Amino acid sequence: MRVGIPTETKNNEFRVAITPAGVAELTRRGHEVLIQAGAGEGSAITDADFKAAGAQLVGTADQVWADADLLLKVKEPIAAEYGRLRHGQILFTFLHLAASRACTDALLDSGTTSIAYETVQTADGALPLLAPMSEVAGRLAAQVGAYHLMRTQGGRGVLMGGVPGVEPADVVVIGAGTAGYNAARIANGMGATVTVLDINIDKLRQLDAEFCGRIHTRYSSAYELEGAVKRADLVIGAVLVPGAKAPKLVSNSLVAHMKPGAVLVDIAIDQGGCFEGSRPTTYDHPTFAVHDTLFYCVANMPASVPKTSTYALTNATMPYVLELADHGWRAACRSNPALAKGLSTHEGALLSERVATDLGVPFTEPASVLA
Numbered sequence: 514m515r516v517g518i519p520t521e522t523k524n525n526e527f528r529v530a531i532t533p534a535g536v537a538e539l540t541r542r543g544h545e546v547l548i549q550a551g552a553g554e555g556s557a558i559t560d561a562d563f564k565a566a567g568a569q570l571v572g573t574a575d576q577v578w579a580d581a582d583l584l585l586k587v588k589e590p591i592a593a594e595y596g597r598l599r600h601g602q603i604l605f606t607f608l609h610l611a612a613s614r615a616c617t618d619a620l621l622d623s624g625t626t627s628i629a630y631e632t633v634q635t636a637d638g639a640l641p642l643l644a645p646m647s648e649v650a651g652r653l654a655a656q657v658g659a660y661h662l663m664r665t666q667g668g669r670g671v672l673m674g675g676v677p678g679v680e681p682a683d684v685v686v687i688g689a690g691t692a693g694y695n696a697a698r699i700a701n702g703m704g705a706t707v708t709v710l711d712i713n714i715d716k717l718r719q720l721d722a723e724f725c726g727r728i729h730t731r732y733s734s735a736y737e738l739e740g741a742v743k744r745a746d747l748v749i750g751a752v753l754v755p756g757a758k759a760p761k762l763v764s765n766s767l768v769a770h771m772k773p774g775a776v777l778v779d780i781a782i783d784q785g786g787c788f789e790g791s792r793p794t795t796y797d798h799p800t801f802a803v804h805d806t807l808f809y810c811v812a813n814m815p816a817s818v819p820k821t822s823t824y825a826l827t828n829a830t831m832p833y834v835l836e837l838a839d840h841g842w843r844a845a846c847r848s849n850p851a852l853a854k855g856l857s858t859h860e861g862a863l864l865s866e867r868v869a870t871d872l873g874v875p876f877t878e879p880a881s882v883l884a
């Protein structure tokens with residue numbers, strides 16, 4: 514058994530799918546760990562750090578993919594990587610197959626076995642590998658929203674927390690899930706007057722207790738959302754629905770009635786976004802205009818703080834990585850139903866019903882390959 518970790522190849526993808534701690538634990542259990550030279554540098558992990566932990570440093574991506582029985586990544590394989598996919602390999606990474614027929618087809622045709630980080634799901638319904646990325650994105654949303662509120666960024670020119678005697682930014686967070694909770698928490702810590710909207714009153718009750726009412730909570734009726742958004746300096750869209758696409762909760766018509774220079778940060782942009790006018794941008798020109806407002810729609814936000822997010826992710830993936838390495842995909846999935854819910858492809862079979870219907874291709878019951 515060799516576990517291989519290649520360098521991430523997507524635009525501004527600085528994260529890596531393992532850290533020296535994880536390398537140490539794998540090598541201690543008798544597994545070889547092959548890591549592409551430079552793979553951790555985006556995350557401030559040097560080749561020397563990885564080697565001291567037991568990793569075999571490999572000069573090329575091609576050798577990692579060729580030699581590895583278990584291949585750990587952060588993002589989905591891109592076109593340039595399709596020719597590296599292999600029948601006898603297990604790939605464990607964020608896949609988002611519903612968003613790519615091409616990626617889905619590449620995995621099936623290769624016959625490879627793949628497990629998606631984002632559909633690994635515990636009995637209580639939680640998504641333990643997606644969770645830390647939602648936490649990072651939410652906290653990032655507050656700090657990037659604060660920055661783009663500066664007049665020198667085209668924003669309204671409002672300081673998050675005000676100063677004594679002067680109004681703070683009015684911040685509206687749409688969605689009180691993991692991402693939204695974390696956005697409201699940081700925005701609140703910066704001094705902003707934060708209102709969180711959700712249709713799940715239990716989540717609002719949780720926010721109300723945690724901050725003793727300092728974070729305002731409003732039931733998200735259409736009337737309430739319009740009114741709050743109209744008054745906001747900063748709107749953070751954090752309604753991320755697990756699976757298919759995000760609802761368009763904020764219309765361009767509504768945007769036209771917003772304060773000039775208001776900033777809208779969509780952290781559901783990887784699901785088409787929850788604003789109507791949202792188009793996925795990137796760090797080069799992260800913002801565009803919509804009716805005198807500024808939209809921030811950068812996809813893959815956690816990639817911008819890789820030192821943090823590499824650890825957040827791999828801390829969460831570690832026990833699954835160890836199970837897969839120790840026991841192989843089938844035994845691991847048989848023993849751990851949370852991991853089985855991530856099973857995506859195997860030997861040309863597509864194993865996600867939700868992915869299959871969204872693409873309109875056949876689905877093979879996961880039970881048929883596990884039992």
Ligand SMILES: CNc1ncnc2c1ncn2[C@@H]1O[C@H](CO)[C@@H](O)[C@H]1O
Pocket residue numbers: 687688689690691710711712713716733734735738751752753754762
């Ligand atoms: C108005 N429409 C809406 N407004 C506010 N939150 C919503 C919403 N639709 C879904 N959500 C919430 O989004 C959160 C995270 O996806 C969940 O807590 C949902 O309850």
